[PDB]
From a paper:
Replacing the 3-tert-butyl moiety of isoxazole with less bulky isopropyl showed comparable inhibitory affinity (6c, 77.3% inhibition). However, this compound 6c displayed an affinity twofold higher than 4b and exerted a considerable [name]α inhibitory effect with an IC50 value of 0.203 μM. The most active member in [name]α assay 6c elicited modest anticancer activity (SK-BR-3; GI = 33.17%, MCF-7; GI = 11.92%). The five-membered ring isoxazole derivative 6b, possessing a tert-butyl group, displayed a good binding affinity (KD = 0.44 µM) as well as the isoxazole 6c, featuring an isopropyl moiety with a comparable binding affinity (KD = 0.68 µM). The isoxazoline moiety of 4b, isoxazoles of 6b and 6c, and phenyloxazole of 8 bound to the hydrophobic pocket B are oriented in a parallel direction to the phenyl ring of Phe138, isopropyl of Leu107, and perpendicularly to the rings of Tyr139 and Trp162, as seen in the figure. Overall, these interactions are quite similar to that of BIIB021, as expected, i.e., the purine made almost identical interactions while the pyridine ring was oriented in a parallel direction to the phenyl ring of Phe138 (π–π stacking distance of 3.7 Å) and isopropyl of Leu107 (π–σ stacking distance of 3.9 Å) and perpendicularly to the rings of Tyr139 and Trp162. In contrast, the crystal structures here pointed out that the isoxazoline derivative 4b, isoxazoles 6b and 6c, and phenyloxazole 8 showed less π stacking interactions, in a variable degree, with Phe138 and Leu107, due to either having lower aromaticity than the benzene ring (6b, 6c, and 8) or even lacking aromaticity entirely (4b). Thus, these five-membered ring-featuring purines had a relatively less stable conformation than BIIB021. Considering both biochemical and cell-based findings, the isoxazole derivatives 6b and 6c and the p-tolyl derivative 14 displayed promising [name]α inhibitory activity, with IC50 values of 0.203–1.76 µM. Furthermore, the structural findings revealed significance of conserving the aromaticity at N9-substituent of purine to make a proper angle between the purine ring and the aromatic ring (107°–110°) and achieve good binding affinity and hence considerable [name]α inhibitory activity.
Residue numbers in the entry: 16 to 224
Amino acid sequence: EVETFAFQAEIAQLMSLIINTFYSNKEIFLRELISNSSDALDKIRYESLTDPSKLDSGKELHINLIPSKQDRTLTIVDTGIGMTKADLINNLGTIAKSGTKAFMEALQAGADISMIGQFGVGFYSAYLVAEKVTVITKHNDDEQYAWESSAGGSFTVRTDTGEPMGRGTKVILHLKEDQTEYLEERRIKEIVKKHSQFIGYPITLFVEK
Ligand SMILES: CC(C)c1cc(Cn2cnc3c(Cl)nc(N)nc32)on1
Ligand SMILES: CC(C)c1cc(Cn2cnc3c(Cl)nc(N)nc32)on1
């Protein structure tokens, strides 16, 4: 079963702005996704201090960056807390409404798209480089889900039948045809050292076979 949902109007407007605005400094998407992964790793680590069983789904706390030339994808994998079905459909978007409005107003007052993370909605910077984003996620005591959207005002959620992940999130960026530089090892290394060099979890940049 695939369920299709409409974005909140403000989120759809944000996605259109990210897709349509002329803005050359697209590389900031990676720092935003790595920051989200780091936040998710912080959360599971904190919760494990009072409930060690929360790591029964995996003790390693890390971030992997995986390019695929065959699929034209860059995947950001973390073993953080993961997202529930309710997170994916309702709750993260409810939280994001506030930051979206503030970000859009800041842009009209002279802010820049690279500041998106200061409003807590940096996930959507993925659409600077991706025509479609697939999110595979697994939270303890919920199922493994695939969320997906090519924008246009809707997203889907389904139970995921792929390789079980244990716990965490994979953000699969289906890159636009002109954004394949983000598959290059040298380019990702440059961006990670520029914007994400103090993240408190190991970041492994996989190499393409
Ligand atoms: C899927 C769309 C709707 C989305 C993604 C985000 C950012 N985000 C919130 N919780 C997260 C966790 Cl637990 N892990 C990671 N990696 N990112 C997270 O917010 N909305
Ligand atoms: C694991 C948790 C603490 C977390 C928080 C974030 C920040 N963040 C980035 N983009 C977001 C969107 Cl679009 N929505 C919402 N609600 N939060 C977003 O990322 N992960």
